[PDB]
Amino acid sequence: EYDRGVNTFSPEGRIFQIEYAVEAIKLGSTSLGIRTPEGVVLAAEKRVPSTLVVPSSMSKIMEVDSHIAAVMSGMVADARILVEHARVESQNHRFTYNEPMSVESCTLATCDLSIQFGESGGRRKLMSRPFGVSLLIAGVDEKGPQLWQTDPSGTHTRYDAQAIGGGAEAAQSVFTERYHRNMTLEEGETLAVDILKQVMEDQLSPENIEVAVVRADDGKLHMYTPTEIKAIMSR
Amino acid sequence: SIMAYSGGSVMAMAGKECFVIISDNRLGEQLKTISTEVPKLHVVNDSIVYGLTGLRTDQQTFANKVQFRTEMYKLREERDITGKAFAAMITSMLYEARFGPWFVEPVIGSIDKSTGEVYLCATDLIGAPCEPEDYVCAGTAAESLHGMCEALWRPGMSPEELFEIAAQAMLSACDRDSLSGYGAVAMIVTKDKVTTRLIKGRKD
Amino acid sequence: AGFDKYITVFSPEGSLYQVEYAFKAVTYPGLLTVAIRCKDAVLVVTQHLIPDRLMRPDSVTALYEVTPNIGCCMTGRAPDGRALVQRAREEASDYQYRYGVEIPIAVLAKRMGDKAQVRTQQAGLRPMGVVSTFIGMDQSDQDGSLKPQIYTVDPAGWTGGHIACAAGKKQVEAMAFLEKRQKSTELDALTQKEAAMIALAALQSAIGTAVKAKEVEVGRCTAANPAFQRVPNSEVEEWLTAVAE
Amino acid sequence: SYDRAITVFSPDGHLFQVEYAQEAVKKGLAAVGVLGSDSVVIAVEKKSAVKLQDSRTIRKIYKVDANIYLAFAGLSADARVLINKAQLECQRFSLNYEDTMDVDMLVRYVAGVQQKSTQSGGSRPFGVATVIGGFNEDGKPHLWKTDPSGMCSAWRAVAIGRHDQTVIEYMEKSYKDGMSRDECVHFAIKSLLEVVESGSRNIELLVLQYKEARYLTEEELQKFVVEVEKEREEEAAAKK
Amino acid sequence: EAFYGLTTFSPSGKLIQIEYATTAAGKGTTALGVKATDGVVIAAKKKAPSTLVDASSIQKVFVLDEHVGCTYSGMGPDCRVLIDSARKNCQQYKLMYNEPIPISQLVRKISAIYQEFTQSGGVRPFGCSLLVAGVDANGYHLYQVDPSGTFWAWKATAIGTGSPDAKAFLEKRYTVDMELEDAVHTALLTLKEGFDGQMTSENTQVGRVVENRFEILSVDQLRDYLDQI
Amino acid sequence: SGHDQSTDVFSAEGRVFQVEYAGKAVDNSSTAVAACCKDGVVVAVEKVHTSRMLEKGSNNRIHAVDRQAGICICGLLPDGRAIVSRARQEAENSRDIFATPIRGSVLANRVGEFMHAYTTHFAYRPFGCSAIIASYADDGPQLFVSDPSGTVAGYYGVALGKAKTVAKSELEKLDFSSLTCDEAVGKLASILHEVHDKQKDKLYEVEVAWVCDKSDRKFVHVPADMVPAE
Amino acid sequence: SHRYDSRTTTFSPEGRLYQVEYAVEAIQQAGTVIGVCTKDGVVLAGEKMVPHPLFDSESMQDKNTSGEKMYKIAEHIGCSVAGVTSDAYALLNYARLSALRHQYTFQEPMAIEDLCRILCDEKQLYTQYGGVRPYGVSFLLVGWDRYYGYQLYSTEPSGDYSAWSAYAIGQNDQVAHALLKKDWHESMTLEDGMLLALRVLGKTMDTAKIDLDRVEVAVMRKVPASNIDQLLDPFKHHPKTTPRFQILTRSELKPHAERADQAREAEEKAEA
Amino acid sequence: TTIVGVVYRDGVVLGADTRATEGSIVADKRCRKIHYMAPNIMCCGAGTSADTEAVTNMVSSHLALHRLETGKQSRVLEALTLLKRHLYRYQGHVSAALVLGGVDVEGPFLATIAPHGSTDRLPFVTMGSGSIAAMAQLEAAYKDNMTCEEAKELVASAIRKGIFNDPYSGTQVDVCVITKDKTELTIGYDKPNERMYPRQEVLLPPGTTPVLKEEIRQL
């Protein structure tokens, strides 16, 4: 329906398109992110459409840089372009300033694109709609391990433990407890895998999901292979 | 310079109800014959024929453009493009790129099919049209051809006689020129028929 | 198939409703102008009534000068007319700059009509609700003399010459009076004072108020002085007193 | 120019234009592509042999690159305008890097175009879902599938076109890992024919091996369709 | 800037905007034109809105160049656009080919603007149908373009209000071997038969192309035939 | 219906409804008044404060446009800011291209022309503010008014705002032929206090500016101790 | 304004593009034209409107390019149009420009399948951008090329094209379909092909004793090459025979018409 | 090239040579340098023939478009303004020195445009290479209010001074006379250099030039 435009305001003040695009997020796969003094952890459920897909092609966890990972939810068609944008901006920040970009700067550079929607072209070409995707960036820079979140609004927010996608409501319930500030990375592993176990219709299998971890001292991104996830489930 | 790079010379003469256009054969690179069997003539229909001269790459580019445009004309307008319209067309084409000029110097000859009127033209490289009543000539052997023709040509020549004067002028004029020769090719076109003749020249 | 009258489209019976409603905007402000041409001059009279008595009686006008030689009156929606003049003035300068002569009057009327037809074709623009009348005197050829000219352009672009035009509120009664007056005499043989008397009589026949001098402004172009210029009230009073008999 | 937003969010978070394109896909001709051990095969529905089409052959599996073939499902004109873009991209890539385009990069570029369509002004999404098969320069057969939504994904035996879920969920429980070159041609027919009419002249098959892709001729296809129909009728006699 | 289209197909397959435009292009004054082995005759009817219109200045027979004429029937302000572009395309041809443009190319060029406006963005179709006439190297011609963009090579036609009867009369009084003055007479005669009063030299306007040129008839020349029919 | 949704739609009686609705928004703004006193001009505006913490000098509606011309925008303040910026671009050009101060009537004509280019297009909305241009160029004191319709008119004394009729009935009885600015800054200021209702808005304040010979023909704000207290 | 946007290029709830369906339904009322692809030529036979007593023909010199229904796209490509007449001319000019620019670049006659694709991409382009109506016209291209000999393609007002051996578009085209697929064999000469055409044409507009004012025929075959001036490019191999698209007059159809109605009465006498 | 223009009693008289040389060689012996602009405006041109013909044809089509628009005869000030605008826009790269002359309701008009764009309105003007040798005559023989016969004698004499004393001019005299009504263009008004020493018509009986192979094509 096209009665109200792409830029109209609702009587409650929130733009219609961004209010609808946030609703499309709860239709996607869930995802997590836990920040800890040792590192940050990103867990997600691939939610394959069939048993035939080679699952390593629908990786919900994309590497943006050797120290910056990003997990998404919603419609994974757009999130790929946000990730290419973050990769280009991070490589530029390494080419110009000769040092790893800061995670908050990557999130800023992502929202800077995600806001540029409208209809009247004129000078610059715009997006005809917001991205129906809520990213989740995690990384390790000098400010320690950091987890940032992004909405289709263009609004970036630093967190400590967040959940996006469908089963995020009960995920925040599991969050309010079972999470102190100074946990161990293994504790984060157990907690995240438990959450995934709790809020998914499928059965948690080492090939079903995907987990990535970024450790502080190493300072590198370390995507887990199914066997390592099996090692976590066996605990 | 740049116009005498590829050599070549073309010359057209008007008879009573006919005309003959003749060109040399040589293609070289400013001294050295690349090939000895390239004529300069292009026939667009049974009453027009033109020959280009200048740089060879620009000869070919301009011939492609002129053929594009002539076939486009015969499609849009269901009829054979006449002589005068053709000459004015290529004049406008040449003057368009006036500061990026083509290095050709075309030589058009044409005849009215039923009317019987002959029409010669020879533009400069920047589009200046120049239509005489007797003959035109262009190329490296311009001055020599002018000299031979202004002495050999006379008003009311017939075809089998006009071909003689044309052949003799082209041969004697390319003999005193180092960038032309190797025989010649002539086309004598009348109201009723068009004839092509290869003319034995010095293999010098 | 529902609206048919909110943009520039044809309605089933073959009409452009936006150009049919733009004729109701000219007759809205209640003004009425009459332009006439005698043997030697062109006159244009307009109602210039400021019912408010705090307003400067010399600020709001209807007569504008497009070129030193061509003037115009603008009947209808007051701002529109103003804007239109600017366009006309622009077209003069371009012309004056590009061809080196001052722009003829028929050329200006034709171009200002064309500009009006463009708005009645694209969906975006709104048609100018103003009936423009350009008056002037043009060079007549084969004898060199100056011949008077009156040209009208409508919101649709129906440019046309005239012998005497009336525009605005109750313009039909004015045209009827002018037609009845013409059936007897020959307008292209009258002199300036008679012509102005006929124009004022037509205007006082169309509204029926016996106008005074300060409610009408009169502009004139004469073979003697070819420039457009407006005539003072000391002259209009002389025609009012003469019509009074 | 005209760049009004067309694909906009519905009051439930559903892109009506994308769902409507994915509906126009379901009304097309099917296409089943399966992945074998050392060769990948693709089968297309070849609408009909109407006794009026030119006796000359025209193919329905398009050669996007010397080693990458494509088979679409959906609207035909947009399919051609997408194949042309892909063929231009392969040749630009093997001009800026001297290296032949892998399959995966081509799938990513085509899915990028698909998705850019659903986020541009004045353009509706392409109504095509494609299956892209091929070999890298080190063997490694790859088989990918894109959607009008732009979400590409690598499969192992995929079907597109009408009755999509039926064929997929049928041939997922009958796909053995690591088939042979003559297994695939049998497994491609036996699964595709579960949706097509028994007519044997509306099937067009392609096998694709390392540095060699050849189409299976009419009698070659008949030899296998008879074996397939016999196995199916045997499975039926086993049902009852 | 309203880049979308106004005219669009309908379930029945009709560009119904074009039907409205062709009705709007048949409500104007009546014009007509006839052919003869010696030339073409165009005859319009200057319906004066009032006795104060200066019948000298309103015109319905437009010269396009030394060899082409025109007349319309519909919205005058629309026909001004087509006349202004037609004269430009007639001069651009003499500029590049140095030859009087043939009529067929002229109509193909101005029938290409009708179609460009029936398919552009944010514009409505034109509402005027022309009557082109003139000479070229292969004889005399009389075409009749339409708002939909089509054009036809008539031999005697009539457009406007009162066309279905004017063309009916023209069916009967036409002859394959007509000279030129016969054509002028029959044009004026079929205009009178449909004239609401009696036509004067300033109530009509005819143009007759003879042997190289269009030459709109003057007031005295037009009179010389009016008081002879 | 829909015939009153865009600026490019004539009503059945040839009225552009959107501009009447625009003028309706000016009819509801704070009061302003102005007098052209044959040796200078005086504009005086009512500022209705919605808050008693507002610093004096906020939401001043009288803006200088050139040395000698000023604009008082009765109506929507943001749109008045656009018009003031456009008038400033028009006045700086004549001081740049033509080496001369812009004549008052020309400035009013240009401001009206700019206000009217927004009531022809389907993609704009008419300005919701009426301007009062007070200029004193080498052609004498000039006071013009521009309505959202784009129509300009020169006055001797003009009244705008919510209370426009009763505040105009005050200006009929001034002389305007012998009236001097030095007393007009008292007269108009008292007129606004007489017309101002105080059981609707608890906070209000009068701000007045003038351009005459005493200020070196420059448009400035009145000296603070020249407005009567109430 | 954006509220009166008809939105031509949108997907309807069932993936159908309404404007393209309406264009198809528009073409159905246009004139029927059929085209049969034989082994030594290809024929296009269509029906043009009833001739008013006052119609004239533009006295065109060299009348072999444009008839009333069939047109020439290049020396070796003819086409026939069905649908909105004045819209077909824009695409026809575009196709002429395309088939001339390829010859400007490569100096070889463009093959039918290349052009048929290059002017269907244009027809599709409007179905996806711009937001304006699509070209409501359908083609029948016939021509000859060294790649596949006599070809014959058919176009939809949506960009898709298809190669046919004998096709028909316009009024009652479902009838001519069932009739052409009924009788067409590979071993059919050109003159027997033309007999198949008119025969099934008269049946589609229901005329016994086919008429010669309401029919237009255009044949595309190979004639022996004509202007081979080998002495002006001694390294240019000119083929011995060149294709020529030719539109049939009254003097040369009447012989083929009297045999068509004669075959009609032959296959009619044997109905009892 | 040598072009002269003389304003006489009623109208103007323009004259020019006919020889056109393409780089120190006489290309054509009877070229025409008095172009046409309007029924009452002629325009001689000197310098590069390309630009002289191009700009003249351009503004000659523009004036025709314009007088179809307005309906009046075209004024020479309009042609002069168009020409000078176009020429000055190109900084003299369009090297055509023009002599533009016509008749209006304002009487005759004769102006000259330098290739840079500057114009002068004079009683008589001369441009070209032999513009110094021709002007020398007009200064010595121009009296005011000359009759048509005197203006034509004077223009012919002023041209025959450039014909004989300049290498880049000659072989004929083109003289056009413009009045208010008519415009008569006589081409061969004077041909001083007559055809002397008749041709000998060398005889070559057809066949003397050997031919290898011939393809005749009947039509």
How would you explain this protein's 3D organization?
The PDB classes it as hydrolase. The entry lists the keywords Proteasome complex, inhibitor, peptidase, hydrolase. The entry is titled "Leishmania tarentolae proteasome 20S subunit complexed with LXE408". Chain A: Proteasome subunit alpha type. This is part of a larger assembly, with 8 protein chains of 8 kinds. Chain D has 240 residues and is α+β, with helices and mostly antiparallel strands. Chain D has one domain (1-240). Helices cover 37% and strands 22% of the residues of chain D. In chain D, the strands form 2 sheets. A 5-stranded antiparallel beta sheet of chain D has the order 8-1-2-9-10. Chain D has a 5-stranded antiparallel beta sheet with strand order 3-4-5-6-7. In chain D, a hairpin with a 2-residue loop joins strand 3 and strand 4 (68-74). The radius of gyration of chain D is 19 Å and the shape is globular. Chain E is globular, with a radius of gyration of 18 Å. With 229 residues, chain E is α+β, with helices and mostly antiparallel strands. In chain E, strands 3, 4, 5, 6, 7 and 8 form a 6-stranded antiparallel beta sheet that branches. The longest helix of chain E is centred in the middle third of the chain and has 22 residues, at 76-97. In chain E, a hairpin with a 2-residue loop joins strand 3 and strand 4 (68-74). With 230 residues, chain F is of the alpha+beta class. Chain F has one domain (1-230). Chain F has helices at residues 17-26, 77-96, 104-116, 165-169, 181-195; strands at 32-36, 40-47, 62-64, 69-75, 129-137, 140-146, 152-154, 157-160, 205-212, 220-221. Chain F has a 5-stranded antiparallel beta sheet with strand order 8-1-2-9-10. A 5-stranded antiparallel beta sheet of chain F has the order 3-4-5-6-7. In chain F, helix 2 (77-96) packs across helix 3. In chain H, a hairpin with a 4-residue loop joins strand 11 (173-178) and strand 12. Chain H has helices spanning 49-70, 76-89, 131-141, 148-165, and strands at 2-8, 11-16, 20-21, 26-28, 34-38, 41-47, 96-104, 107-113, 119-121, 124-128, 173-178, 183-190, 211-218. Chain H has one domain (1-219). The interface between C and H is medium-sized, with 13 and 15 residues. Strand 11 of chain B pairs antiparallel with strand 13 (211-218) of chain H.
